[PDB]
Design a protein around this ligand. Sequence first.
Ligand SMILES: Cc1noc2c1[C@@H](O)[C@@]13CNC[C@@H]1C[C@@H]2N3C
Ligand SMILES: Cc1noc2c1[C@@H](O)[C@]13CNC[C@@H]1C[C@H]2N3C
Length: 130
Amino acid sequence: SMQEEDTFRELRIFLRNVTHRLAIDKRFRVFTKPVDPDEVPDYRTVIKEPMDLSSVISKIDLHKYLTVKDYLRDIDLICSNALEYNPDRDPGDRLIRHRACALRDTAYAIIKEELDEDFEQLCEEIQESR
Ligand SMILES: Cc1noc2c1[C@@H](O)[C@@]13CNC[C@@H]1C[C@@H]2N3C
Ligand SMILES: Cc1noc2c1[C@@H](O)[C@]13CNC[C@@H]1C[C@H]2N3C
């Protein structure tokens, strides 16, 4: 229905706003673009599903996310990818792990404060009906 298409358009407006706020935070610059295969040819041999915030906006605009939960799976993948590629005790690895945990915790905190649980449940029920 038109009403259902309006619900999904509001979901995309909400997701774009959360994503652009994460992308302007200086702590999360390393997560704003895909890893450059030239600088890091080893990356795509270890990490099987690369993800970054520019890819997330592209996916919002392609209608890939029908629920909040769908979107948070990709935020969780940006974080898990950084934890698995950078697992060592040295300061460069510890700094990117701390920034990756902060990106994940920040996204979940904005959604807890600013999403209504009934809007999230409406999107699930429309998705399940399709
Ligand atoms: C902050 C914030 N930004 O959007 C929202 C908030 C909450 O206060 C609220 C709870 N009931 C009405 C508010 C609208 C929406 N919502 C989840
Ligand atoms: C994102 C991301 N996840 O692990 C890494 C990144 C890069 O920023 C990088 C700096 N340039 C290539 C290096 C691989 C590595 N590291 C910190």
